[PDB]
Amino acid sequence: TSHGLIESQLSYYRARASEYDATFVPYMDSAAPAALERLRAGNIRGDVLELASGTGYWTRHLSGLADRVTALDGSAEMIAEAGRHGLDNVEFRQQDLFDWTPDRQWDAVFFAHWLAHVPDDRFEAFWESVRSAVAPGGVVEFVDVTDHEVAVRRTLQDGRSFRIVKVFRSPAELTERLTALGWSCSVDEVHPGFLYATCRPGPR
Numbered sequence: 296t297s298h299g300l301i302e303s304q305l306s307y308y309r310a311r312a313s314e315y316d317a318t319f320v321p322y323m324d325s326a327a328p329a330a331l332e333r334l335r336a337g338n339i340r341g342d343v344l345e346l347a348s349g350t351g352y353w354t355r356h357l358s359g360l361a362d363r364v365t366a367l368d369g370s371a372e373m374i375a376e377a378g379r380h381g382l383d384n385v386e387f388r389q390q391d392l393f394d395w396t397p398d399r400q401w402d403a404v405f406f407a408h409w410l411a412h413v414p415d416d417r418f419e420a421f422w423e424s425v426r427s428a429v430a431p432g433g434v435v436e437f438v439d440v441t442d443h444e445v446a447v448r449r450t451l452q453d454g455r456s457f458r459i460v461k462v463f464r465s466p467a468e469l470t471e472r473l474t475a476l477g478w479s480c481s482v483d484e485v486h487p488g489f490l491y492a493t494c495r496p497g498p499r
């Protein structure tokens with residue numbers, strides 16, 4: 296995967312930030328209760344890190360569960376949108392997640408719809424950075440879509456064209472891959488098409 300692809304994908308979300316919620320909210324509505332049940336199940340506690348926080352759809356929920364949230368997104372436009380929620384215990388930071396190495400640790404790491412934007416060749420390095428971010432006894436949870444070209448082309452009507460990574464991975468694929476990377480995982484289809492995963496890092 297090229298930097299061109301990574302930048303294109305990020306640029307798409309920079310362009311979409313102001314209209315993101317109008318699309319995302321009704322998209323997520325049916326699966327939201329099942330996802331929120333797992334989110335509130337007791338692992339999102341203490342100091343929480345969110346990756347690819349977007350408009351703060353999940354950040355709003357994390358803020359209510361955590362003592363403090365650090366929320367990272369590559370788009371300043373997204374961070375600006377996320378500020379609308381007025382969450383007092385959240386620090387937003389602009390960060391390209393493909394350049395990211397943490398300099399502290401958190402009790403829980405959460406991301407929604409992020410992993411499917413991570414191509415196979417960047418998967419291991421991403422999980423190495425996540426591993427470093429997890430405090431002793433910490434946990435990683437995530438939401439994504441299952442599957443039952445690495446990227447899709449999306450062209451806006453003005454002509455802007457983007458490539459966006461779309462690698463939906465099954466519960467079996469995710470469990471197998473994360474096992475291979477030294478994690479223990481439970482990945483469950485909480486609503487048709489939608490997965491919730493809980494992951495614990497092994498000794499290495």
Ligand SMILES: Nc1ncnc2c1ncn2[C@@H]1O[C@H](CSCC[C@H](N)C(=O)O)[C@@H](O)[C@H]1O
Nearest residue numbers: 305308347349352368369370391392407408
């Ligand atoms: N290279 C990159 N580094 C950090 N964030 C990136 C990125 N490429 C895309 N993103 C962010 O990934 C998010 C994808 S959409 C998912 C947003 C949110 N988690 C939700 O579920 O609603 C966008 O907010 C986009 O800005």
